[PDB]
Design a protein around this ligand. Structure first.
Ligand SMILES: COc1cc(Nc2nccc(N3CCC[C@H](C(=O)NCc4ccc(C)cc4)C3)n2)cc(OC)c1OC
Length: 288
C-alpha cells in the first residue's frame, strides 16, 4: 500500500470506492490492459471498465493501483471521472466515465469534411474542443499537476454528435517518449513545469486544426528533437486562421517563461471564438 498526495490530501488504496463485482456487467470491448463498455447495477450506470491482466508483473500491479488513486482525486468536468474500482476480484477493474465519442484523434480523422459529408465539422467545433481541454489543463495546472502527454490520442469525447465535450482521459532507450509533444527543455534538464503542458497543448492545437494529422509529418522522433531544439516550428495546418496559429507559436516559445499559462490560453481561445473571420473560415475538404 503506497500513499498518494493531491491538493495536500493524502489517500491510499482503502479510500477508493470499491464496487461489488456482482454489480458490474461487461457489455462489449472498446480497446486495449483492455477496456470494455460496462454497466453498474432499472436505471443502471453505464461505464467504461479498464482491466488489469491477471498475469502481469509486480510493477504492472503497482502502476494500475497508483493510476486509480490519481484519477479518483481529480474532480473536474473536463477530466474523465473514476466511478470506482473493483480490486478485490480478478481481474481487477477501474471504472471510468464512459466516453461514447471515443478518442479525439480518431474522431477528427473520421469526421473530416468530405464530398460525402461536407459540413461535418466547423471551426467553432474545433475551438470548443480546444477550450474544453484548455479548461482541464488549467485545473491540472492550478492543482500543481503536470500531465506530460497532452495529445489528441489522450483526449476523449462524451458523445459523437453535437453537444460533445472533450475531456482529458488518458495518461502517456526512449522510443516510447512522446517526443513530438515535448518542449526543448524536457530533453535538456529533463525538468517539468506546467509550461511543459503549455507546449504540448500547442501541439494538440495543431493536431485539432489539422483534423487529426500526425505532428511533423515527415520527421522521426530524433529529427523532431533536433528540429525543435534548433528553433524549428510547424507550419500552420491547412486553412488555419492566423489568430489560431499565433496561439500555437506562443505555446512553442523556446523559453518556458515566454509561454502563456492556461488562463491566458483560454482568453485567447475565447477571442478567436468571438472573431467572425476566424469561425467563418471553411475547413479543407479532403477528397473522397
Ligand atoms: C466509441 O468507442 C470508444 C469509446 C471510448 N471511450 C472510453 N471511455 C472511457 C475510457 C476509455 N478508455 C480507453 C482509452 C484509455 C482510458 C484510460 O485508461 N484512462 C485512464 C485515465 C487517465 C488519466 C485521466 C485524467 C483519466 C483517466 C480508458 N474509453 C474510447 C475509444 O477509443 C479509445 C473508443 O473507440 C473504440
Amino acid at each position: 500500500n503506497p500513499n498518494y498526495s493531491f491538493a495536500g490530501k493524502t489517500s491510499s488504496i482503502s479510500d477508493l470506492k470499491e464496487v461489488p463485482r456482482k454489480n458490474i456487467t461487461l457489455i462489449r470491448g472498446l480497446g486495449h490492459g483492455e477496456v470494455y463498455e460496462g454497466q453498474v447495477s432499472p436505471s443502471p450506470l453505464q461505464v467504461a471498465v479498464k482491466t488489469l491482466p491477471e498475469v502481469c508483473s509486480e510493477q504492472d500491479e503497482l502502476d494500475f493501483l497508483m493510476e486509480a488513486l490519481i484519477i479518483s482525486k481529480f474532480n473536474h468536468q473536463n477530466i474523465v471521472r473514476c466511478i470506482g474500482v473493483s480490486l478485490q476480484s480478478l481481474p481487477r477493474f477501474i471504472l471510468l466515465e464512459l466516453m461514447a465519442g471515443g478518442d479525439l484523434k480518431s474522431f477528427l480523422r473520421e469526421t473530416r469534411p468530405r464530398p460525402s459529408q461536407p459540413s461535418s465539422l466547423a471551426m467553432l467545433d474545433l475551438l470548443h474542443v480546444a477550450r474544453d481541454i484548455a479548461c482541464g489543463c488549467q485545473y491540472l495546472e492550478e492543482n500543481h499537476f503536470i500531465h506530460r502527454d497532452i495529445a489528441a490520442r489522450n483526449c476523449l469525447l462524451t458523445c459523437p454528435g453535437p453537444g460533445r465535450v472533450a475531456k482529458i482521459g488518458d495518461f502517456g532507450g526512449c522510443a516510447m517518449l512522446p517526443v513530438k509533444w515535448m518542449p526543448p527543455e524536457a530533453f535538456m534538464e529533463g525538468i517539468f513545469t506546467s509550461k511543459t503542458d503549455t507546449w504540448s497543448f500547442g501541439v494538440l492545437l495543431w493536431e485539432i486544426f489539422s483534423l487529426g494529422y500526425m505532428p511533423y509529418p515527415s520527421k522521426s522522433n530524433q529529427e523532431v528533437l533536433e528540429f525543435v531544439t534548433s528553433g524549428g516550428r510547424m507550419d500552420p495546418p491547412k486553412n488555419c486562421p492566423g489568430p489560431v496559429y499565433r496561439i500555437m507559436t506562443q505555446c512553442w516559445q523556446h523559453q518556458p517563461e515566454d509561454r502563456p499559462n492556461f488562463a491566458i490560453i483560454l482568453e485567447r481561445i475565447e477571442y478567436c471564438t468571438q472573431d467572425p473571420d476566424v469561425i467563418n473560415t471553411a475547413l479543407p475538404i479532403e477528397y473522397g
